Curated annotation (Swiss-Prot), chain A:
<keyword id="KW-0832">Ubl conjugation</keyword>
<dbReference type="GO" id="GO:0022626">
    <property type="term" value="C:cytosolic ribosome"/>
</dbReference>
<dbReference type="GO" id="GO:0019843">
    <property type="term" value="F:rRNA binding"/>
</dbReference>
<dbReference type="Pfam" id="PF16121">
    <property type="entry name" value="40S_S4_C"/>
</dbReference>
<keyword id="KW-0699">rRNA-binding</keyword>
<comment type="subunit">
    <text>Component of the small ribosomal subunit. Part of the small subunit (SSU) processome, composed of more than 70 proteins and the RNA chaperone small nucleolar RNA (snoRNA) U3. Identified in a IGF2BP1-dependent mRNP granule complex containing untranslated mRNAs.</text>
</comment>
<keyword id="KW-0687">Ribonucleoprotein</keyword>
<keyword id="KW-0689">Ribosomal protein</keyword>
<dbReference type="InterPro" id="IPR014722">
    <property type="entry name" value="Rib_uL2_dom2"/>
</dbReference>
Curated annotation (Swiss-Prot), chain B:
<dbReference type="Pfam" id="PF01479">
    <property type="entry name" value="S4"/>
</dbReference>
<keyword id="KW-0963">Cytoplasm</keyword>
<comment type="function">
    <text>Component of the small ribosomal subunit. The ribosome is a large ribonucleoprotein complex responsible for the synthesis of proteins in the cell. Part of the small subunit (SSU) processome, first precursor of the small eukaryotic ribosomal subunit. During the assembly of the SSU processome in the nucleolus, many ribosome biogenesis factors, an RNA chaperone and ribosomal proteins associate with the nascent pre-rRNA and work in concert to generate RNA folding, modifications, rearrangements and cleavage as well as targeted degradation of pre-ribosomal RNA by the RNA exosome.</text>
</comment>
<dbReference type="GO" id="GO:0003735">
    <property type="term" value="F:structural constituent of ribosome"/>
</dbReference>
<feature type="region of interest" description="Disordered">
    <location>
        <begin position="161"/>
        <end position="185"/>
    </location>
</feature>
<dbReference type="GO" id="GO:0042274">
    <property type="term" value="P:ribosomal small subunit biogenesis"/>
</dbReference>
<feature type="cross-link" description="Glycyl lysine isopeptide (Lys-Gly) (interchain with G-Cter in SUMO2)">
    <location>
        <position position="138"/>
    </location>
</feature>
<feature type="modified residue" description="Phosphoserine">
    <location>
        <position position="152"/>
    </location>
</feature>
<feature type="cross-link" description="Glycyl lysine isopeptide (Lys-Gly) (interchain with G-Cter in SUMO2)">
    <location>
        <position position="92"/>
    </location>
</feature>
Length: 262, 185, 124
RNA sequence: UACCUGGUUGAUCCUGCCAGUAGCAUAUGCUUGUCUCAAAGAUUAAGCCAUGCAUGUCUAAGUACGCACGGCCGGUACAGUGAAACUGCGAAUGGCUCAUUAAAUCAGUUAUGGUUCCUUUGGUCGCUCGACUUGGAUAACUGUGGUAAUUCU
RNA sequence: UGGUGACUCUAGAUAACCUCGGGCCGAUCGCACGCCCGGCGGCGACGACCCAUUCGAACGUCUGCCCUAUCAACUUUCGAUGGUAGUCGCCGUGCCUACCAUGGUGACCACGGGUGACGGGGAAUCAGGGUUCGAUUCCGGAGAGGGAGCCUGAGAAACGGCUACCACAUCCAAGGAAGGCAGCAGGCGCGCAAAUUACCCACUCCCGACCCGGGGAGGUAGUGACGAAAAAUAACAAUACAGGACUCUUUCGAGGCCCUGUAAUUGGAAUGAGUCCACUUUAAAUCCUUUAACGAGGAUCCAUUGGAGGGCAAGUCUGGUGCCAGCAGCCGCGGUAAUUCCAGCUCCAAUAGCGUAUA
RNA sequence: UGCUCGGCGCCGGCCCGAAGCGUUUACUUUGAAAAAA
């Protein structure tokens, strides 16, 4: 081609979108934003599928442009605004709030939250930078540039940032024994405790994280998020709590739910 | 670029030897007591049974106490007992290999209608199924090649809009009554 | 004779409207037109029958149960605000201009054959 | 479903081939009630095209002295709608085809610590030590012309 | 100060430079209106050097591509190989200049030629092992007759942008103007071979100053026996009669209630195709479904295709020509008693499908 | 397979953990990375 692509095919989108196959030949291509193309969730698909508030592409424009939506405490007007991991969705007229977190599988899930919980946002540092006059600069996962942070913030540290102001409130150091979140890949959306990390020079570092049920796995360093200091999470967990519960006992619990329902 | 499905598969299959005596005699026989239209229906049934026996063959190829084998086998025997071709006591993994075409054709809707005593003959059962006279859990069914589940077996009854089980008389009895009252005076 | 039961009732209050899924139960008769469906739905929800926009009615095999959608607003101006135009045309609230898109295409071409205020009179 | 059958001889065993058997997708022929999907100028011609269409765009927030409409007490400018035109935006997307191309393209994996990036997001934007608003050019418009004609001037 | 596995990294300090074809340090516009004593205030929109981020693009590293020896040596200072110094390029590099040495690849198949070669994700066949195709909706690459060159713009060597060539080709008062359907429909040419000069932005997305406009992107309809899926062409009752199912008469005879089967004997029960009202669907219809009024006794509301010696399920049936006409994928059937030719009857195979030729 | 820093433990001392290193290959086994259909 001679330039950037402005179109997205319906089957070209990855699986975590969870779309259909006959209702359209085109998919909603998200606009440029803080997050990458593969891991994102636009407003249009979330509103017209997860909540089913709008049934039409004109209807989702009517539900969006009337300034009833809050993203990181700010009102937006884009229909293809990329809202990825650990983002807050607030609706003032309805009265409920949502936070964008992964499910136990490779997809996003809805999560109703209390409003007083919707005042801070966890962020993961990408790099530590120095400004033009010795000013320390910080880059989060949503590219939120923060000036003058704490000196105990490193490359792979996680911080708590207030939504209404944008200042550093709390932070968690990266060491073994902390509760962990995994974002990205086939092994995605799970809760565990970091126990072992080895270092590879010039390669991708792999960490070893033990599950609370004793399950063992290993993922890359770039797909590691910290959501708690030790064993207590700072964020309220959804139903399922990231165990990667195995197939035969979703079969067993589905038969149990069917016999209990009658 | 269109929003099309483009997915299909053949349901029947043709044998290698077209002209023969024996297998022709058994398929003509089973059409004889089961009342089938043509050879393509039993070709579809044979293809489905060959698929499920092939799937059982690579299921039994894998070793014992394997998770996906156990899960696929439990799901397959649960499907086979819920369609009614097996019985609830004999749940074993290799008894799928010991069933034939008559077990598949027993759960046909025509056989259930004929053995339930609401039809005279199997041909009468076929023409009455094709004429939409049966409600199955309050649902009008037309297709004769219908698989009846074990739990959906006691709900077979005449449809409420049929004149046989109670309802308005059709075109012909109304015509006979009209010509009778016309000729009466 | 003909009854309506509510299903999947949800109140999206920000749109000043409520959504619900319509099934129509009627034994041994034709497909029911939407007028008395709207009247009975409005009588069920204690509303006058003017803010209802039902669409998409399909008939099952047998006709004992026909599915559909159900829609209610709170005011006529809000129904005029966020609604598809063809539903208003079915209800007789909005009318469109009757020329085809081909005639508009050659019309726009005939304006772009000139420049300036000649576009105002070359295309009548 | 891990399959054969007829054919050299006066008759018998073998190499061996021919021909039947089943599917796949192209044309054609015969024939034809219902209904759900659904391919379709690719193989010769990436040969030639008459015609009609396929890219346009305004909110409260860039320019409004077109009475083209239109509100009054009109006088310390502009109520409002507004064709047209100036201005920035995209026109490098999408659609069709396989003519070239044989470590070329492409697939998996890697690096740019050897470079760029419209727009969006976040920050930077009194960090420098020396006017209570500056200037002239062009539209649209009016009027005047040549061409056989153009989205000509 | 801070970081990488690693900087000639970022930051810090010093001396200057700082391009008139010229880096920033707001001479822009709307909304609600105000406090204090002329100054002082919020919510925005637009623009803006610098970064990181986002869509990416670009050159690279390792591994994997059809056939051919009637392709055995190939490339070289008209750069082939690398070193030094530069030019250009957004950077890295013979990408290219000036000087150097003769280098680099090959039997593990280079070099050369052909390909009925766009590649892959895939499709058919498939015990296992394999063979063939992939133009084709997903991804990436190439071009818009073929080369060449260029403006604008962040991003184009763009062709529904421009310039010159040849080939084709439109109009003309003859001086000159105007061209690229391998886009949507449609025409010519070609061939065994391939559809309407239709409706609409309503659904899915895309562009724009932007809820509001536009989009042959697409959706809808028709042509459509490419192919796939479901699925009409009747059954019960009594009479046409060979006797079995069980007991008996040496055998016929009888008990015979399920009888089983077939004849244009009769009888009622019915539903569809179609004719159409309504309703539904839809931008509006058509399609499907529901429902009125109709609508079958040779249900004339009439089912074809190749065959009947063997392979290979099906008449030594009848009549006609009698090495001629012909049949026959192969054996072989025709010379005056044709189980194969040509016609009528019956029968077998699949069934709205069947046969033939090319791979 | 062992020789500079610190840990579950106890009164200059034992054990454990660890900065650092402790023959290359194929194969075997477990993980990540691995577009959708």
């Amino acid at each position: 081609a001679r330039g950037p692509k402005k179109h997205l095919k319906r089957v070209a989108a990855p699986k975590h979108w969870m779309l259909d196959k006959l209702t359209g030949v085109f998919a909603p291509r998200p606009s440029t934003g803080p997050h990458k193309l593969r891991e994102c969730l636009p407003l249009i698909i979330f509103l017209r599928n997860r909540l089913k508030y709008a049934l039409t592409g004109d209807e989702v424009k009517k539900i969006c442009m009337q300034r009833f939506i809050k993203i990181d405490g700010k009102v937006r007007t884009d229909i293809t605004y990329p809202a990825g991991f650990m983002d807050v969705i607030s609706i003032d007229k309805t009265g409920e709030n949502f936070r964008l977190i992964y499910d136990t599988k490779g997809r996003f899930a809805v999560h109703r939250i209390t409003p007083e919980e919707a005042k801070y946002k966890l962020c993961k540092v990408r790099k530590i930078f120095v400004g033009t006059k010795g000013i320390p600069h910080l880059v989060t996962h949503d590219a939120r540039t923060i000036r003058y942070p704490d000196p105990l913030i490193k490359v792979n540290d996680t911080i708590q940032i207030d939504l209404e102001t944008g200042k550093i409130t709390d932070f968690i150091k990266f060491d073994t024994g902390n509760l962990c979140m995994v974002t990205g890949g086939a092994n995605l959306g799970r809760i565990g405790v970091i126990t072992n990390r080895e270092r590879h020079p010039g390669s991708f570092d792999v960490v070893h994280v033990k599950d609370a049920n004793g399950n063992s796995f290993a993922t890359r360093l770039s797909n590691i998020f910290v959501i708690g200091k030790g064993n207590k999470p700072w964020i309220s967990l959804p139903r399922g709590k990231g165990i990667r519960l195995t197939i035969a006992e979703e079969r067993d619990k589905r038969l149990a739910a069917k016999q209990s329902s009658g | 670029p269109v929003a099309r499905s483009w997915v299909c598969r053949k349901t029947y299959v043709t044998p290698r030897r077209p002209f023969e005596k024996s297998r022709l005699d058994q398929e003509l026989k089973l059409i004889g007591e089961y009342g089938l239209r043509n050879k393509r229906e039993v070709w579809r049934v044979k293809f489905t049974l060959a698929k499920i026996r092939k799937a059982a063959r690579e299921l039994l190829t894998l070793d014992e106490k394997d998770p996906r084998r156990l899960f696929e086998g439990n799901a397959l025997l649960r499907r086979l007992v819920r369609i009614g071709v097996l019985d609830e006591g004999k749940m074993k993994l290799d008894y799928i290999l010991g069933l034939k075409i008559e077990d598949f054709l027993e759960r046909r809707l025509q056989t259930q209608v004929f053995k339930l005593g609401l039809a005279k003959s199997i041909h009468h059962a076929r023409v009455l199924i094709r004429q939409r006279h049966i409600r199955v859990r309050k649902q009008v069914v037309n297709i004769p090649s219908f698989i009846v589940r074990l739990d959906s077996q006691k709900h077979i009854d005449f449809s409420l809009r049929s004149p046989y089980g109670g309802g308005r008389p059709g075109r012909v009895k109304r015509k006979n009554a009209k010509k009778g009252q016309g000729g009466a005076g | 004779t003909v009854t309506i039961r509510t299903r999947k009732f949800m109140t999206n209050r920000l749109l000043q409207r409520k959504q619900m899924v319509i099934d129509v139960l009627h034994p041994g008769k034709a497909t029911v037109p939407k007028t008395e469906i709207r009247e009975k739905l409005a009588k069920m929800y204690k509303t006058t029958p003017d803010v209802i926009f039902v669409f998409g009615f399909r008939t099952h095999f047998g006709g004992g149960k026909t599915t559909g959608f159900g829609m209610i607003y709170d005011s006529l101006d809000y129904a005029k605000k966020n609604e598809p135009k063809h539903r208003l045309a079915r209800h007789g609230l909005y009318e469109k201009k009757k020329t085809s898109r081909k005639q508009r295409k050659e019309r726009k071409n005939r304006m772009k054959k000139v420049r300036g205020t000649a576009k105002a009179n070359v295309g009548a």
